[PDB]
Amino acid sequence: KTVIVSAARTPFGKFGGVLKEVKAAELGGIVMKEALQQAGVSGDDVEGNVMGMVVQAGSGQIPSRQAARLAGMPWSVPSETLNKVCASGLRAVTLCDQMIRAQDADILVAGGMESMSNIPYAVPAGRWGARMGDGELRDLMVYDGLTCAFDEVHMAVHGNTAAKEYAISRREQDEWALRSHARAAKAADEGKFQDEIVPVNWIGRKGKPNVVDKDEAIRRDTSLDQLAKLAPIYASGSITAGNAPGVNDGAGAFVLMSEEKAAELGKRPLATILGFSTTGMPAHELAAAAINKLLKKNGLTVQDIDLFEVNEAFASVVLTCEKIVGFDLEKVNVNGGAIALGHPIGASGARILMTLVYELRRGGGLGVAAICSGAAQGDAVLVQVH
Amino acid sequence: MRKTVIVSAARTPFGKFGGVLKEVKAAELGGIVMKEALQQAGVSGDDVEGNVMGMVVQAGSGQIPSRQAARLAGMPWSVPSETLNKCASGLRAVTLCDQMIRAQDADILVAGGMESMSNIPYAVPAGRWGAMGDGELRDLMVYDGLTCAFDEVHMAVHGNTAAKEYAISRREQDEWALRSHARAAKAADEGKFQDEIVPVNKPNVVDKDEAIRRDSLDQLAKLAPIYASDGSITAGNAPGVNDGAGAFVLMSEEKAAELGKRPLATILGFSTTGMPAHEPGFAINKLLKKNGLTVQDIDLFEVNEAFASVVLTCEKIVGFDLEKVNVNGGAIALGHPIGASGARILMTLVYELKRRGGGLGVAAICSGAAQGDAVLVQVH
Amino acid sequence: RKTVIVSAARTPFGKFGGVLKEVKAAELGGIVMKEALQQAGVSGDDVEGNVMGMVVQAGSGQIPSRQAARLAGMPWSVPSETLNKCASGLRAVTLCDQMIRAQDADILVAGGMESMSNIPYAVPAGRWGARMGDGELRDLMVYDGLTCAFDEVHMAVHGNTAAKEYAISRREQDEWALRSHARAAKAADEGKFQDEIVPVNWIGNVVDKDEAIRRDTSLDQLAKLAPIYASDGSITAGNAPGVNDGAGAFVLMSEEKAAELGKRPLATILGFSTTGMPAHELAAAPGFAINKLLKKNGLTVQDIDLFEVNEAFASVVLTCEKIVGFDLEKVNVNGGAIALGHPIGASGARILMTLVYELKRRGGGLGVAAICSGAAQGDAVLVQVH
Amino acid sequence: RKTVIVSAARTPFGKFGGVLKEVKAAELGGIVMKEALQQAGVSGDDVEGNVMGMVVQAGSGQIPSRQAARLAGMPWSVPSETLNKCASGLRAVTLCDQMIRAQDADILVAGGMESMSNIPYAVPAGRWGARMGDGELRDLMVYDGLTCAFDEVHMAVHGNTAAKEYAISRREQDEWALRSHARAAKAADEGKFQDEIVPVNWIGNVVDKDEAIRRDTSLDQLAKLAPIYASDGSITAGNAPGVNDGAGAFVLMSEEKAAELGKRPLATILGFSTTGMPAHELAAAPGFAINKLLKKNGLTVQDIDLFEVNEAFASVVLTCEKIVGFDLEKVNVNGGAIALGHPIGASGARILMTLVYELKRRGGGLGVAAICSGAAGDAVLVQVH
């Protein structure tokens, strides 16, 4: 099996916010470097890295390698950039698990990175010309990142569709949203994010020192009344700017090793990867997805699980999962989620797994992390935290 | 053991830039190859456990292009999918799948590469936050696909650097290109690419590679070097930008056996190498030492023709006889849809070796930021 | 004190993206200005001022008329401005006539030019940014040139409104369109456009014939065409001119100067009229201008030997038939813009020119040139041809 | 036959991306033409035509001058034209003067407008395609507006060239710059721009002051400034104006028509001169334009009470000293474009009016307004009543 030796994330930034100046490759390098520092592992020793990134446009050749070089890894470390939309930050970890299990490696770096703030605009008729009449200035973040390729609708449209399907009320979504924010704010104040987060420090333009050491998106200060008064976002629907995360900047990484290698090097791992699941479904079934399948393979019931993390693409997802999974909500995203913390799409997958790990401070046990992704794919990972 | 076998393989013709496949999207090219490979494999989409598709410049292609291609190929929503980025991508997809099979996580998989350089978009980096004074209208193909993120040069610059370091003359490079063109044309005419090409279908039909130019040394010696006044690489000794896709049905040797499939090839092993940016030769050697093999034991080699300079450096590093090397030509003649070339070289090596009722082959590829991927194959 | 036209020239009219695609508006302008001067037997050193009509100036640089003026071999000392009124080419002449009549000048160069092929697309979101969601890649030629600022509609819409208002049928428009092609082909074939046309020669080529004239055209082909910018309209690609490239220019003088220099004037400008009407009434604007001009000059329609009414739409000329009462055989005798194209800032120049040359050829007399323009403006000129 | 200026008004001048950022040029234009009509006591129905200067027309839609006139309340009946000459704002007035003198009209409205903040960027490779390799996102304000078509350089380069050709030191230019802010600050404070300025109101908001005047300037802050567009240059951000938002307009009439209506004109236009020169001789053109206007008119420089020479650069006014030989105490007494900004299409209009109002507050008379324009000169002589 595969074990998680270390885990770090950058704090998550608001769109056009605190990490606006920092490229996706830069956030990646920082977490990859920090993860290596935590594991007491030199970059010289890594056998490969995988970094998730959803919208790669304009970031240059092989963003994953660019990050790995920033991290301090030698040219000798093989590298690849992965796109599984949403699920990318976490699919990277599982993929690396697959590599180790196939016996090709014992020390790998895995993760996710996203700089939504820096995704460029495109000119689709730029190359061959528009010839006559108005054309488009395509926002690639919306197009490649948040737009379904089959139904041609914003992701929030699937969020709504799920709300309808499972009879999930606007108020119940709103209440969930409030909980994400309150639970996050409290977790942050209590320092529960200290273990996962590493700061981003840079000398900016004009010599300005910059230090970003805490998550930007948490609203303090919010209330049910405020949430209730929001207008629905992509349908005149129940999804609003309140009950869905925004668009954000962030990154996260892990040092993954075989159980044998970690032992020989005398590292005390954070957790072990028992196994993973993946699901595929019609595009509009984004909310559904996977955890159930994972449990069944491992001869486990929802009851055996101590804690779950389900990415809050929308409140409607977690809630859909409640109907599908049957977990107790008090065991689910105990420190908030994406709604409060933001959703750098490439990084979200890394964060939930990571967070779940640090929480299971309870001298903990069995955790499950799950994510939905564009085109109705589901990814689930079961962990045994020590 | 367990080991990975290539059950089937197909590719599209490789189109010229703004050429015959200009209107066809990369997901579309991918869908066709993924579909044909399953047909040739005699396997239903419903039994595929996964798909990995290489694609270098994903910009403006929509969410998850592999999944788009996968759905276009007839695979159900249940089949999981990804989209990968490594030059090497076409081929990294096959090896990554090989790891998944060896990890014992699946028995049937679809892997490949796709690229539509014709459809890569231009970008406005100042559009979102705003530009006073002129800005850039950036060519994402050049920028994301063909430019070194480290040295901030075009890849041909790296090609020239190799020529300088290994003392590879402009004339030898030109000789290799001529050779690439002649062998490919001969191969097309003898119908050797037929086993691997699947046509792409105001009805239109594209059934043949578009980039072969029939012509000689004299002409090549006359060409201006591209990103160097003083360089040896030219439009002539290097491939252009192109449109294409390729895909494979891959299985565990065990699963194919259970089904009565007689696979094209068994994948013996693979190596990856990494290097400073100005630097697939080292990769091959690595693959050979691990397998207790040497240059002599291998029947044929496919080394992607990123530049004439590349294969020629490898000879100096690996020491193969060029007579065993890109026998039906290469990328200089056939074009380079970057995400796809990795699939093509493996495939087209497998097919030539097969025609020869043959045996061992090595496919190797160079990629941006100096990475190298090589695969060892026993063809049946 | 009156204004005489001493000389006149135009370039052939190119098709959109056609023979003049690589030639800029000012270069086309420099050529007509040069030819006009040469034909008049006058040195640039002697010009007291220049005015060039140009409609979509975007991206052609500072003061295009001055670029053209220098290209024409005119010295630095000669004052220049760029004019924007579809009427710009004519208005440049009338403005110049007012100048001479004010006693400010005795020799002027007036004209108009357009390189519709060279008009850039624009990115209205560019300067301040798009932030999030799609923007527009705006076609300046359609926006600035072909779109009504008031009704926010394509000019074809007003063409249609006119047809409905005056009960001009689709078939009449088509018959008129067809007549234009037939007559333009005939005139060219007979050398009739030689007097106005000057060739454009350049290495990147020889351009000396009007590009847009169709010879294989018939009612059958025309009637099959779909309506444009409406569904249900009567305007089509056939009965409306396309978008085009070209320039036209004139040497103008006071009557006294030309006599003093021993020049044989082509014509004497007797007078002019301008009108403004509500936006939808573009078609009527020129007819009303002619009627105003005629009243002012003691003249009736019967008193005019020939009329040129710019063919913005076939509906326009037919609309003018209803208002003016002229006989259609005394109008656009060698065809019009439907046939030869409409390089917008230059049409007004051609129609005058070609009215002049036709009447000459007839040992001729009295003529009226009229043009409708955007925001429903009307311009008419009466010429006494010698 | 002569032309009189019955009325005049301008909007405040806004900084780039400033207070007027959200106002289109046609709109700035519409307000000024309505105010000029109200001030003159003339109905839009009585107007015989309009001309509005405007430099960068791109993206503003069909006939920006006509858009402005309707917004001003003029009926569809009034003929209109949009004009492009730096000098566009002033030239619209002289153009109209020539129409009145041709006996073609007795009532016209002339002016200029510019919204530099609203000029779009362009994609030259957008229509026919870039094909391969990077292309340009071109800033039309800079390209069409501020760059010489012939010499392919920013106008500041011509600004430098003059200083050098005429030996106008960095220090002299800077003293002038400080002077422009000082005076501009003083008049604004004392209500001296009150006559010309007309407020811009818009619910989205009130703008009734010039935004660009920098109180708090000094010669050591001006001297510390880096040269722009040339590393060895002497024109700076300090001694040249920026890019601005604004508009101005006038109600014009024949002398007879004005007398017929009971109007008491602000001023009478005595004549005007237009000059042309090699492109790098930008600074010299207005200077030559003035001398020609004085001579054609039997006048000497001593004959003029007040001069307005647009502050394209400090270098321009200083070059004009040399050429014309005026006393500077008579030049730009209430500051200029350096302090006020330069919405290029409207500056010519502003200078004529500020001049007229100044001469008028002194109960005075003879004035010359001059301006340089791209591609290298316009001058106007007026009798202020």
CSV table of C-alpha atoms in Angstrom, one decimal, chain B residues 17 122 131-139 141-142, chain D residues 121 123 130-139 141:
chain,number,residue,atom,x,y,z
B,17,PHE,CA,-1.8,23.1,-40.5
B,122,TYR,CA,-5.0,32.8,-29.6
B,131,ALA,CA,-4.2,46.5,-20.6
B,132,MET,CA,-2.6,51.9,-21.6
B,133,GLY,CA,-0.3,50.9,-24.4
B,134,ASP,CA,-0.1,47.9,-26.6
B,135,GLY,CA,-0.3,44.3,-25.4
B,136,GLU,CA,-0.1,40.9,-26.9
B,137,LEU,CA,-2.2,38.7,-28.9
B,138,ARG,CA,-0.6,35.5,-27.9
B,139,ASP,CA,-0.4,32.3,-29.9
B,141,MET,CA,0.2,26.8,-29.7
B,142,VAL,CA,3.6,28.5,-29.8
D,121,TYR,CA,-8.0,48.4,-28.1
D,123,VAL,CA,-6.9,43.4,-33.0
D,130,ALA,CA,-2.9,35.9,-37.2
D,131,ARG,CA,-2.2,32.3,-38.6
D,132,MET,CA,0.8,31.6,-36.5
D,133,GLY,CA,3.0,33.4,-34.0
D,134,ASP,CA,2.0,36.2,-31.8
D,135,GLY,CA,0.3,39.3,-32.9
D,136,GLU,CA,-0.7,42.6,-31.4
D,137,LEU,CA,-3.4,44.0,-29.1
D,138,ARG,CA,-3.2,47.5,-30.2
D,139,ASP,CA,-4.1,50.5,-28.1
D,141,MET,CA,-5.6,55.9,-28.3
